[PDB]
Amino acid sequence: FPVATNGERFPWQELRLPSVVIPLHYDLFVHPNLTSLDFVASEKIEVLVSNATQFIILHSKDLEITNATLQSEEDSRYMKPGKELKVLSYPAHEQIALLVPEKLTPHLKYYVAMDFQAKLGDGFEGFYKSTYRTLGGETRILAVTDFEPTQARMAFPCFDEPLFKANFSIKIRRESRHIALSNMPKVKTIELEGGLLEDHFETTVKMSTYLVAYIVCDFHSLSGFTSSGVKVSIYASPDKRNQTHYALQASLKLLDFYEKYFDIYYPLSKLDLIAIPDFAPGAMENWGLITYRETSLLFDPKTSSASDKLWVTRVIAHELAHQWFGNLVTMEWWNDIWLNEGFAKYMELIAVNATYPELQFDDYFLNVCFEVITKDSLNSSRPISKPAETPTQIQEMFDEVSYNKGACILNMLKDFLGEEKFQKGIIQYLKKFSYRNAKNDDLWSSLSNENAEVKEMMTTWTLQKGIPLLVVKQDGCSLRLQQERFLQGVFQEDPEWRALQERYLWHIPLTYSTSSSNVIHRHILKSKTDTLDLPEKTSWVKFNVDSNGYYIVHYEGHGWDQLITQLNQNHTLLRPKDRVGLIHDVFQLVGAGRLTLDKALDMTYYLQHETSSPALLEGLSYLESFYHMMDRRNISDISENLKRYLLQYFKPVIDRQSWSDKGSVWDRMLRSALLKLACDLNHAPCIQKAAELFSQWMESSGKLNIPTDVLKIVYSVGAQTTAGWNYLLEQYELSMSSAEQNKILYALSTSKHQEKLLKLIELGMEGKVIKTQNLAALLHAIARRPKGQQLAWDFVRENWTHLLKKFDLGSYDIRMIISGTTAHFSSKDKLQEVKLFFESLEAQGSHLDIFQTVLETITKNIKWLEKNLPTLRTWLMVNTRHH
Numbered sequence: 001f002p003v004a005t006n007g008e009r010f011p012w013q014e015l016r017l018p019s020v021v022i023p024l025h026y027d028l029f030v031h032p033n034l035t036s037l038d039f040v041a042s043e044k045i046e047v048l049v050s051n052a053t054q055f056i057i058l059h060s061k062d063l064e065i066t067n068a069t070l071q072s073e074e075d076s077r078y079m080k081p082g083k084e085l086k087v088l089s090y091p092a093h094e095q096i097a098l099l100v101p102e103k104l105t106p107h108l109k110y111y112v113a114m115d116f117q118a119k120l121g122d123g124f125e126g127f128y129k130s131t132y133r134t135l136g137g138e139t140r141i142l143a144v145t146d147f148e149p150t151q152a153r154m155a156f157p158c159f160d161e162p163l164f165k166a167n168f169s170i171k172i173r174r175e176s177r178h179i180a181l182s183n184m185p186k187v188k189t190i191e192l193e194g195g196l197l198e199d200h201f202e203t204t205v206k207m208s209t210y211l212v213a214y215i216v217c218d219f220h221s222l223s224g225f226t227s228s229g230v231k232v233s234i235y236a237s238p239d240k241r242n243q244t245h246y247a248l249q250a251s252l253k254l255l256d257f258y259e260k261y262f263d264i265y266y267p268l269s270k271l272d273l274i275a276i277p278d279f280a281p282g283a284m285e286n287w288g289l290i291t292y293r294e295t296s297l298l299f300d301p302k303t304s305s306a307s308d309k310l311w312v313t314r315v316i317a318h319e320l321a322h323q324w325f326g327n328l329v330t331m332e333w334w335n336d337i338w339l340n341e342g343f344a345k346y347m348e349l350i351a352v353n354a355t356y357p358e359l360q361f362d363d364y365f366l367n368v369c370f371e372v373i374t375k376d377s378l379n380s381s382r383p384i385s386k387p388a389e390t391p392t393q394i395q396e397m398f399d400e401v402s403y404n405k406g407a408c409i410l411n412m413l414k415d416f417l418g419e420e421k422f423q424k425g426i427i428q429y430l431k432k433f434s435y436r437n438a439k440n441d442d443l444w445s446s447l448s449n450e451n452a453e454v455k456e457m458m459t460t461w462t463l464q465k466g467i468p469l470l471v472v473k474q475d476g477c478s479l480r481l482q483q484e485r486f487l488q489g490v491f492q493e494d495p496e497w498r499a500l501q502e503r504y505l506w507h508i509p510l511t512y513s514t515s516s517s518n519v520i521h522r523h524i525l526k527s528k529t530d531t532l533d534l535p536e537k538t539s540w541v542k543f544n545v546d547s548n549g550y551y552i553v554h555y556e557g558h559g560w561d562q563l564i565t566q567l568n569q570n571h572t573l574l575r576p577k578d579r580v581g582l583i584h585d586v587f588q589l590v591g592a593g594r595l596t597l598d599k600a601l602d603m604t605y606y607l608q609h610e611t612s613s614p615a616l617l618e619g620l621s622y623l624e625s626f627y628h629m630m631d632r633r634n635i636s637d638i639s640e641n642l643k644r645y646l647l648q649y650f651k652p653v654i655d656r657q658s659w660s661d662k663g664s665v666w667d668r669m670l671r672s673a674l675l676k677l678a679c680d681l682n683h684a685p686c687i688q689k690a691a692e693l694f695s696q697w698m699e700s701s702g703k704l705n706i707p708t709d710v711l712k713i714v715y716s717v718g719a720q721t722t723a724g725w726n727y728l729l730e731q732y733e734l735s736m737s738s739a740e741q742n743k744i745l746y747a748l749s750t751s752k753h754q755e756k757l758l759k760l761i762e763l764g765m766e767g768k769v770i771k772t773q774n775l776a777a778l779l780h781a782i783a784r785r786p787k788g789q790q791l792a793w794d795f796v797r798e799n800w801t802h803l804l805k806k807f808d809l810g811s812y813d814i815r816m817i818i819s820g821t822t823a824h825f826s827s828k829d830k831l832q833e834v835k836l837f838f839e840s841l842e843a844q845g846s847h848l849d850i851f852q853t854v855l856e857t858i859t860k861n862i863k864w865l866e867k868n869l870p871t872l873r874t875w876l877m878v879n880t881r882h883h
């Protein structure tokens, strides 16, 4: 039924490749030219034929195939010369067909040889070109690969599905001014007649096609050896070698931990980490050659803050964990992508907390779960395991549900089974499926070895969307436990609520503590309703200890009153993470209609005595978001009352903040948040100090030691004048620090001149001074402010076709460009314009799940204002009289 490009019929119909021909070994030779910006290449694929067939089906996209032969040492019909193969192209499924002269014999091995060529990509996928700037002002070119999920077919024809694992022998031809890096160590370099060089790399272990990598560049490196003898090297552009020191130290510690914790050595001799100047994701876990964004790998003590230090440590730990969860053990199909991303996201918590406990990443992990709850509490969410077929649908699987929710339900399972039993389970899981593939049921069986308990439990957490809501009622010593599906913007008395609660049931591993006993008590909630008996008549009971469970708790009667009373009288009687969860769940239930906003704002009164930075920053984030929500809607009477309440009720902790980098990680993050909040509210002492620091910095004409914790704040104030704004843009182009450029670009986005904001968008589109990889984050930073809100929304609508040429439809950049310019809307006027814009894109044949997610988010903001805006106005006005 499918027709090929030459008019003939295509002998294959399905998007999935046939299983009759299995690849065993790839011989891959690539000859890129960094002057003509193209390449020629050839390959020889050793395949095993299990079923007699007249054709071979392979993936190939945007590749010109010139030769195609089939040889065999076991089938004499295809001896040493071979037989020519006729190729048929079917771009709709990104497949090609290799028609053989005589049907292949089962159980015999063959060799598929092909010559192919194409230009270097101009985007971020496949084998594409990237540029960087030297300290002297030179621009250099490199060639780099990025294949996950389905872009290996853009560089070489292959069975581009993760189940078709095979060995890879890679050879790269290059000039003497370049080096060549790949997955495996370089075995030898041969000099060619014309003066070129050809690097031969060791044959890889069994691995999926999306992990193949090769780079041609002129980077420098710093090297070190782990305890197991693995040579770790950090690669970066030559003028940035000093910024690779921390990456090497962290990689050595983290790789050693992963080897001991997983009880499985890293199987390769070397592991390279390279900072790519043009890179779309944070990083990519190519086996033995992990590619990074410069902000994800490089660290400069002069311009990188402690939160940047935490960020680099997270990404390195994330990609090194992938060497086991991802490279060693891969999912069968992208429907279970969370087996890689969820575990790698989870192992961040275990590895960073064990290797760098001073970073206090354990407290920051709650933000990972709270972030995905925002999208999981909407109906437009999805189960973490969901079928996916098209390349766009596969790209949509890389979201907060696979990453964040996967890590959070794994942390919940760890707390239910215990660290020792959980660690033993994943060790058996990794050893059982080494160099093979696994699905969800494989993981549940490995963690089972009570058995049917964890499989039936985790089934409801992976095949059902959303997050459950635990409702607790307390009378005397009796506890009535009820579970519902937590919905945002949908009240219980709404007609849609009944239709959204049916056939939703979770096996929730409940954990609770009381005021009489701090001992943790556990109970598995399997049904819709259950009862529990308490030993003593306690004053309160706090469920979900430390928020280890992926569920929200609501208390009926005086439940919240008892807990809020406890916070105002003796807040240290509640665990520090219990306070974080309480502050979080209270404001979530206000949006759910189970609590009025004044009850939530009453809890924030105790924050005057809160010294635990996680809880303090959590409560401040809601008050800060409320202010910006009013500011964007020009509700000046509420925003002014919120500004005065913040600057007055939290004046003690604000005034005692220094403009330095002293203290622990959370001390420095508390400083940056408080001083950013104060300066955003135009607090005169904050503005006077920040403008003084920027003045001295600019008057120095160079870089004086400005504390990194206040670096983003100082630059933001300096960008409020055209003189300082022009100087920052000049400093941006000359900066050798990607972290500083990140902070500088944020400062330029805080300008109130629309001509300056449009210039940044134009520069981001041009991609020369401001790289296009920062366009999505730049549009978001401009849109979240009142002066740039309309500009960004207008730009996305008017230049949609131009944006779709820079990124793929399913790319994460397009997702943030759409969401980052629309999600913060909260008026029916904007909801209509967004609804019409999405409908026009649907007419053009572009469908994304982010469309309904944005629409539901905007409706939630509308209904949140309709239900709580007068309460917020009244509570603030009552506060001006309570003083």
Ligand SMILES: *[C@@H]1O[C@H](CO)[C@@H](O[C@@H]2O[C@H](CO)[C@@H](O[C@@H]3O[C@H](CO[C@H]4O[C@H](CO)[C@@H](O)[C@H](O)[C@@H]4O)[C@@H](O)[C@H](O[C@H]4O[C@H](CO)[C@@H](O)[C@H](O)[C@@H]4O)[C@@H]3O)[C@H](O)[C@H]2NC(C)=O)[C@H](O)[C@H]1NC(C)=O
Pocket (backbone or CB within 6 Å): 032, 033, 034, 035, 036, 173, 174, 175, 194, 195, 196
């Ligand atoms: C990516 O693509 C680029 C562009 O195509 C390649 O760069 C060019 O590579 C070619 C081939 O290496 C270079 O051309 C050669 O230059 C040599 C140096 O020339 C000097 O010496 C001669 C006398 O010997 C003088 O006349 C000349 O003015 C210079 O002073 C020449 O010696 C070579 O000539 C010989 O080779 C050619 C082969 O085609 C013969 O036809 C000639 O008759 C002669 O025998 C040759 O001209 C060229 O200079 C490069 N360009 C640049 C800008 O550097 C990359 O090599 C390629 N990279 C990869 C990895 O593919």
Ligand SMILES: *[C@@H]1O[C@H](CO)[C@@H](O[C@@H]2O[C@H](CO)[C@@H](O[C@@H]3O[C@H](CO[C@H]4O[C@H](CO)[C@@H](O)[C@H](O)[C@@H]4O)[C@@H](O)[C@H](O[C@H]4O[C@H](CO)[C@@H](O)[C@H](O)[C@@H]4O)[C@@H]3O)[C@H](O)[C@H]2NC(C)=O)[C@H](O)[C@H]1NC(C)=O
Pocket (backbone or CB within 6 Å): 025, 166, 167, 203, 204, 205, 206, 435
């Ligand atoms: C494609 O990639 C796969 C990997 O996925 C390769 O398979 C490996 O092949 C090598 C060489 O044939 C094997 O290396 C040998 O390993 C032995 C121990 O292996 C055990 O332990 C590991 C630990 O993880 C298990 O994974 C494994 O299944 C075994 O249980 C060593 O004892 C060997 O060293 C000794 O033997 C050789 C040969 O006699 C001597 O020369 C040495 O000096 C030494 O005395 C050897 O190192 C490896 O085990 C295989 N791995 C797997 C997972 O099967 C393919 O070879 C590769 N294909 C191509 C064409 O490159």
Ligand SMILES: COc1ccc(C(=O)O)cc1S(=O)(=O)Nc1ccc(C(F)(F)F)cc1N1CCCCC1
Pocket (backbone or CB within 6 Å): 281, 282, 283, 284, 293, 295, 314, 315, 318, 345, 348, 777, 816
């Ligand atoms: C492979 O990548 C990651 C590895 C590990 C982690 C981990 O959990 O530590 C996360 C990512 S990520 O891809 O999720 N990273 C990200 C997310 C959101 C944003 C946003 F701008 F929307 F806020 C930006 C980024 N990065 C960081 C700097 C800007 C460039 C991309």
Ligand SMILES: *[C@@H]1O[C@H](CO)[C@@H](O[C@@H]2O[C@H](CO)[C@@H](O)[C@H](O)[C@H]2NC(C)=O)[C@H](O)[C@H]1NC(C)=O
Pocket (backbone or CB within 6 Å): 349, 350, 353, 354, 357, 362, 419
């Ligand atoms: C973060 O790391 C710390 C330090 O190892 C962990 O605390 C240890 O936990 C084990 C098991 O519960 C105890 O046997 C140790 O005595 C603890 N040590 C200390 C210093 O407290 C902590 O559990 C880790 N956090 C997570 C979430 O895994």
Ligand SMILES: *[C@@H]1O[C@H](CO)[C@@H](O[C@@H]2O[C@H](CO)[C@@H](O)[C@H](O)[C@H]2NC(C)=O)[C@H](O)[C@H]1NC(C)=O
Pocket (backbone or CB within 6 Å): 379, 380, 496
């Ligand atoms: C909430 O989400 C569910 C699941 O996506 C929706 O149920 C499906 O909705 C689509 C389109 O509305 C229908 O084509 C399907 O037949 C529905 N399936 C079922 C089993 O109901 C539901 O409509 C959504 N509700 C709201 C209010 O958006």
Ligand SMILES: *[C@@H]1O[C@H](CO)[C@@H](O)[C@H](O)[C@H]1NC(C)=O
Pocket (backbone or CB within 6 Å): 020, 050, 051
């Ligand atoms: C391959 O051959 C086996 C041999 O029994 C058969 O069961 C299977 O259906 C065949 N599959 C295809 C796709 O021909």
Ligand SMILES: *[C@@H]1O[C@H](CO)[C@@H](O)[C@H](O)[C@H]1NC(C)=O
Pocket (backbone or CB within 6 Å): 239, 242
């Ligand atoms: C890198 O660090 C060394 C260490 O002494 C120093 O000499 C050199 O000037 C530094 N270079 C850059 C570009 O920071």
Ligand SMILES: *[C@@H]1O[C@H](CO)[C@@H](O)[C@H](O)[C@H]1NC(C)=O
Pocket (backbone or CB within 6 Å): 569, 570, 571, 572, 573
């Ligand atoms: C909070 O609890 C501690 C622990 O008993 C106690 O020492 C402290 O006085 C309490 N705070 C107040 C304000 O009572």
Ligand SMILES: *[C@@H]1O[C@H](CO)[C@@H](O)[C@H](O)[C@H]1NC(C)=O
Pocket (backbone or CB within 6 Å): 634, 786
């Ligand atoms: C905000 O409202 C005031 C009062 O109606 C008006 O003068 C001002 O122009 C408005 N500004 C914006 C940005 O909407």
Ligand SMILES: N[C@@H](CCCC[NH3+])C(=O)O
Pocket (backbone or CB within 6 Å): 148, 149, 280, 281, 283, 284, 285, 318, 319, 322, 341, 344, 398
């Ligand atoms: N697997 C990568 C993401 C690849 C995204 C490719 N567009 C990770 O660790 O998150």
Ligand SMILES: N[C@@H](CCCC[NH3+])C(=O)O
Pocket (backbone or CB within 6 Å): 295, 307, 308, 311, 739, 742
């Ligand atoms: N620290 C990163 C930003 C991380 C964004 C997290 N959502 C940077 O330098 O840009």
Ligand SMILES: [Zn+2]
Pocket (backbone or CB within 6 Å): 318, 322, 340, 341, 344, 345
């Ligand atoms: Zn990942």
